[PDB]
């Protein structure tokens, strides 16, 4: 069976254009007559068909929503199909997928997906702020504390607690792309309220793109 | 264009249960319907095409039926690896269209969230921005409403929410809602509260604090 | 020394007998004018018609997903489409127009009728004529109407009446057209 | 094959010259629709059928498959090209000729292979462009084709016509004459 391998993740400024590729390898005669589709998936959203083309014959198909702003092409000689999206805007941040179907027998093979992030941001290390336990962050005999990791770019960050010693009760939340173009997430941990001023709680934030490692002590 | 309508949006079930997902087309599409399974961070995987034909390698407990406008996907004895999101897709005419998806998660005991609120740190306030965080911890079911109130003023458009994956043991979720204000607006007001609506609560719980 | 050309044809053919009691699918793969491989629903699998179709037959019979789509086609294609024909083409009725003119020969022109079933006969003074009658084949006009011409060799006497008699499924009774010398 | 009714769902053609292709459905030997491949548009031949929808991408995708299949066959046949057939031409009117009454001249070009043809009309020796139309290439069970051209006209004593056919099987263009008589 054929394999579809897409080009790597992209970061694009608002108003620019991106061209994602999809190369087929190791298929049977089915891959010489199949139809390539492009499907996008915005963060937290459903699958959305954009358009398609048969590499061996004819012109491209498009959905109304993407008409005139996406261009789908293919090159039989390099076994590669392409999707070009222009005038990029923040709403275009999504995972873009390559897929194929043979005479409409479902889209049976998919690429791994391509992340396209649209923001005006440059590489930026994170700010690490304490989410300090207080009278309004306690419940029975347990308290909640954490770290707000704000205004970094691009993904990802790694977050640990007490250099990895603290793992139980930890919730590191998915990052969210703020309207500023920078990412932001929180990590929280629930601890015995009795140990608050006794046990030292440090969240360790590491951001490889900016060569930044931060250790932040969280106290009341 | 052909609209695909999936119901329900989400369903909670237990391991070993039979689950039936429904897809409806805005017009007759004969048997040109495919079903897909997607897990978080992964590409969709084809289960069924031609409305009822099982893709090679797919486990036999998946079946599809229907013709015309109404279609169903049935998972006959749901396995732990079957908790995921499912999509139908029409192959009748171009442009192709997907349904909105159905998320199948694990059923478990109704658990009210523990609600915690965090004022902005002094280190952030010197930087010129204020982030207030409200934490909803270890709750089930997923549906929860979080409303921010600044001096009893409902905030809209200045907050984002984030959720964890479902805990595989107690089937619970955790949620963080972050309110973003300017430092100037933050020091203009006193009472900061997040009001939580959840099935496991008699009344909406309100966690508040007074600035300073 | 004309240009060189290579042709490939695929025909999905449905044969209907007695409504939908008997339905048969024959999908034919043709290279130039030689049919090389076919799927016959009465056989249930692909068959090579000639040597050139042997690779295709062996390949396609090994693909379970293709085979099951072909076996389903007699229902998904033939029987499904016939239900649409029953509401449309099989309801089409165009009544024939009948005219007579001489040419010694009498020509009965039966023009613009649908469907194809038709019976045309000549009478001489209400006696049916079978000698000296020449009928064209049924003529397909290409626009979903037929025509046919029926010629009668004649030597008329005074008082003779010649009748062209036309029976067709669109008519509540046969059309007759008369001609006198 | 015995059948009350025979349908083609559909006829799929592809050829190297051009290259070019054709997609049609036929019922009882008449054309139901063709897909304009360049415009991606279904074009019905019978008005009662316009209430139906056929997705043009079905045709385009099928032709893609046929393009690949033609490739494999040219390769497998060691480049065995099509044989040119000599076509057969007949010209007749749709209704009996009354001078001054609107009629239609019909030019049947039969036994076409390969499906590449020019069919045009002459009036008193000069070409006629208005009032002309034609069917698609229509299939035959020996896998050649026929094609029918139409010319509307008012029959007139001093005006005769020719159907002119150019084809690689013909050494020179073929003229089939029609007189209003």
């Amino acid at each position: 069976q054929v394999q579809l391998v897409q080009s790597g993740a992209e970061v694009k400024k608002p108003g620019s254009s991106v061209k994602v590729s999809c190369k087929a390898s190791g298929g049977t005669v089915r891959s010489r007559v199949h139809a390539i589709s492009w499907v996008r998936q915005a963060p937290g959203q459903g699958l959305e068909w954009m358009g398609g083309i048969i590499p061996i014959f004819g012109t491209a198909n498009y959905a109304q929503k993407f008409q005139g702003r996406v261009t789908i092409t293919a090159d039989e000689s390099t076994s590669t199909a392409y999707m070009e999206l222009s005038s990029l805007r923040s709403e275009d941040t999504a995972v873009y997928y390559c897929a194929r179907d043979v005479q409409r027998m479902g889209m049976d093979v998919w690429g791994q997906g391509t992340t396209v992030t649209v923001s005006s941001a440059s590489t930026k290390g994170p700010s690490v702020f304490p989410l300090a336990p207080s009278s309004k962050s306690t419940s029975g005999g347990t308290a909640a504390l954490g770290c707000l990791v704000k205004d970094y770019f691009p993904e990802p960050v790694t977050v640990s607690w007490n250099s990895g010693a603290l793992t139980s009760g930890v919730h590191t939340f998915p990052a969210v792309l703020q309207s500023s173009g920078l990412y932001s997430l929180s990590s929280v941990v629930t601890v015995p309220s009795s140990s608050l001023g006794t046990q030292t709680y440090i969240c360790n934030v590491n951001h490889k793109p900016s060569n930044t490692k931060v250790d932040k002590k969280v106290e009341p | 264009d052909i609209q695909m309508t999936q119901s329900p949006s989400s369903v909670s079930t237990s391991v070993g249960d039979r689950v039936t997902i429904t897809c409806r087309a805005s017009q007759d599409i004969s048997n040109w319907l495919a079903w897909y399974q997607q897990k978080p961070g992964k590409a969709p995987k084809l289960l069924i095409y031609d409305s009822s034909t099982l893709q090679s390698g797919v486990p036999s407990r998946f079946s599809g039926s229907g013709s015309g406008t109404d279609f169903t996907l049935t998972i006959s004895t749901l396995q732990p690896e079957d908790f995921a999101t499912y999509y139908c897709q029409q192959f009748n005419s171009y442009p192709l269209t997907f349904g909105g998806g159905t998320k199948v998660d694990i059923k478990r005991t109704v658990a009210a969230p523990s609600v915690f609120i965090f004022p902005p740190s002094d280190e952030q306030l010197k930087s010129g921005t204020a982030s207030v965080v409200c934490l909803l911890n270890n709750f089930y079911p997923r549906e929860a409403k979080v409303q921010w109130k600044v001096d009893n003023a409902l905030q809209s458009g200045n907050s984002q929410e984030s959720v964890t994956e479902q805990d595989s043991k107690d089937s619970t979720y955790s949620l963080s809602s972050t309110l973003t204000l300017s430092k100037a607006d933050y020091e203009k007001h006193k009472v900061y509260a997040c009001e939580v609506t959840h099935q496991g609560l008699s009344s909406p719980v309100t966690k508040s604090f007074n600035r300073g | 020394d004309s240009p060189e050309d290579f042709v490939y044809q695929f025909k999905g053919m449905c044969y209907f007998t007695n409504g939908t009691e008997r339905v048969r699918l024959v999908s034919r793969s043709i290279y130039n004018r030689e049919e090389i491989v076919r799927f016959d629903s009465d056989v249930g699998e692909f068959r090579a018609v000639t040597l050139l179709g042997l690779p295709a037959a062996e390949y396609w019979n090994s693909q379970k997903d293709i085979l099951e789509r072909k076996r389903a086609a007699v229902d998904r294609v033939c029987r499904h489409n016939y239900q649409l024909e029953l509401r449309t083409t099989l309801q089409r009725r165009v009544e024939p127009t009948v005219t007579i003119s001489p040419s010694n020969l009498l020509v009965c022109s039966v023009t613009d009728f649908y469907p194809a079933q038709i019976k045309v006969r000549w009478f001489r003074n209400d006696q049916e004529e079978t000698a000296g009658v020449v009928s064209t084949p049924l003529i397909r006009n290409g626009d979903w109407t037929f025509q046919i011409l029926v010629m009668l060799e004649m030597t008329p006497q005074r008082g003779d009446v010649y009748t062209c008699h036309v029976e067709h499924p669109s008519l509540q009774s046969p059309i007759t057209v008369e001609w006198r010398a | 094959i015995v059948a009350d009714h025979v349908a083609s769902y559909g006829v799929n053609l592809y050829q190297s010259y051009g290259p070019s292709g054709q997609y049609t459905h036929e019922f009882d030997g008449d054309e139901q629709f063709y897909v304009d491949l360049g415009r991606k548009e279904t074009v019905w031949c019978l008005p009662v059928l316009r209430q139906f929808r056929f997705d043009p991408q079905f045709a385009l995708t099928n032709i893609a498959v046929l393009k690949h299949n033609l490739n494999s066959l040219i390769k497998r046949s060691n480049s065995t090209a099509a044989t040119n057939e000599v076509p057969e031409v007949t010209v007749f009117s749709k209704s009996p000729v009354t001078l001054g009454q609107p009629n239609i001249l019909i030019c049947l070009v039969d036994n076409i292979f390969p499906p590449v043809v020019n069919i045009t009309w002459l009036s008193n020796g000069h070409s006629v462009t208005e009032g002309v139309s034609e069917t698609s290439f229509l299939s035959k069970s020996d896998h050649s084709f026929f094609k029918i051209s139409y010319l509307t006209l008012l029959p007139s004593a001093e005006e005769s016509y020719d159907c002119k056919v150019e084809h690689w099987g013909l050494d020179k263009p073929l003229l089939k004459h029609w007189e209003p008589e």
């Binding site: - | 007759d28 | 999908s27 294609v77 499904h80 489409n81 | 559909g10 056929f54 498959v65 690949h68």
Partner: peptide, 13 residues
């Protein structure tokens, strides 16, 4: 209401 087409499949290599 739509007529259904029969579909060809790719010839082997």
């Amino acid at each position: 209401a739509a007529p259904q087409p029969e579909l060809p499949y790719p010839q082997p290599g």
